[PDB]
Amino acid sequence: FRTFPGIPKWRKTHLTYRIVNYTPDLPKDAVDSAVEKALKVWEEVTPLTFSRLYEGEADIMISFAVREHGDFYPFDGPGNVLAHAYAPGPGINGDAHFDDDEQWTKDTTGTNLFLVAAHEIGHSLGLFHSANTEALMYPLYHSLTDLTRFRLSQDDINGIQSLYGPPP
């Protein structure tokens, strides 16, 4: 695993998230399911706990956007960058943005929201990119023939526990 330069991290283990808005591509329940599942992957292997805010400023603000959307990294239309998220800290840090010029799916065929979101939360928590081809935090997007076979790698577990420790 790799962390980010200067090893940014949360210095608290109760985190909040807000889903600021929603993609046209999936029902809200499917997006919520992807986000919750994405949070749970990391929750499971750490002392971190998450709760949702429906207003105000949460730690991890999650949103869907296209092209220019208010930060240093405008999205790029269909393909290429699918999403991004910022390392732990205040304001934009911790936030995760999804390119709504992708077509978001819960299936095996398109751009899978759960898999991307789980990866992005890893960033939001302070994991950078892994050299392990099997890791969630590997830099190149792929999916699975069987989404039920998803498992967080030991490399990812090691990385996140390097930041926050194992579960209590």
Ligand X SMILES: O=C(O)[C@@H](Cc1c[nH]c2ccccc12)NS(=O)(=O)c1ccc(N2CCC(c3ccccc3)CC2)cc1
Active site residues: 120
Q: Measured from the CB atom, is 44 or 71 closer to Zn ion?
A: 71
The reply, when asked if residue 146 is annotated as ligand binding, is no
| 3-state SS, residue 56 | coil
* 25 carries a ligand binding annotation: yes
Residue 95: contacted member of Zn ion, Ca ion, ligand X, none (CB under 5 to 8 Å, by partner type): Ca ion
Q: By CB under 6 A, tell whether 115 contacts ligand X.
A: yes
User: What phi, psi does 39 have (nearest 5°)?
Assistant: -70, -40
Contact partner at residue 20 from ligand X, Ca ion, Zn ion, none, CB < 5 to 8 Å by partner kind:
none
**Beta-ladder partners of 18:** 61
**Nearest in space to 42 (alpha carbons), one of 157, 137, 153, 141:** 157
Residue 94 contacts Ca ion per CB under 5 A: yes
Q: Does 120 bind Ca ion (CB under 5 A)?
A: no
Q: Return the SS3 of 37.
A: helix
Pairing mode, strands 49-52 and 60-65: unpaired
Rounded Cα–Cα distance for residues 20 and 31 (Å): 12
Which stretch in 32-40, 93-101, 145-153, 156-164 sits in contact with Zn ion by CB under 5 A?
93-101
* Those residues with Cβ within 8 angstroms of residue 102's Cβ, 6 or more apart along the chain or in another chain: 78, 79, 82, 110, 111
To ligand X, the closest distance from the beta carbon of 104 in angstroms equals 12
Among 57, 71, 107, 134, binds Zn ion (CB under 5 A): 71
Among residues 20, 81, 93, 158, which is the contact residue for ligand X, using CB under 6 A?
Answer: 81
**Pairing between β-strand 60-65 and β-strand 96-99 as defined by DSSP bridges:** parallel
Asked whether position 84 contacts ligand X by CB under 6 A, the answer is: yes
> Which residues does the annotation place in the binding site for Ca(2+)?
25, 59, 76-77, 79, 81, 91, 93, 95, 99-100, 102
Q: Give the footprint of Zn ion on this chain (CB under 5 A).
A: 71, 97
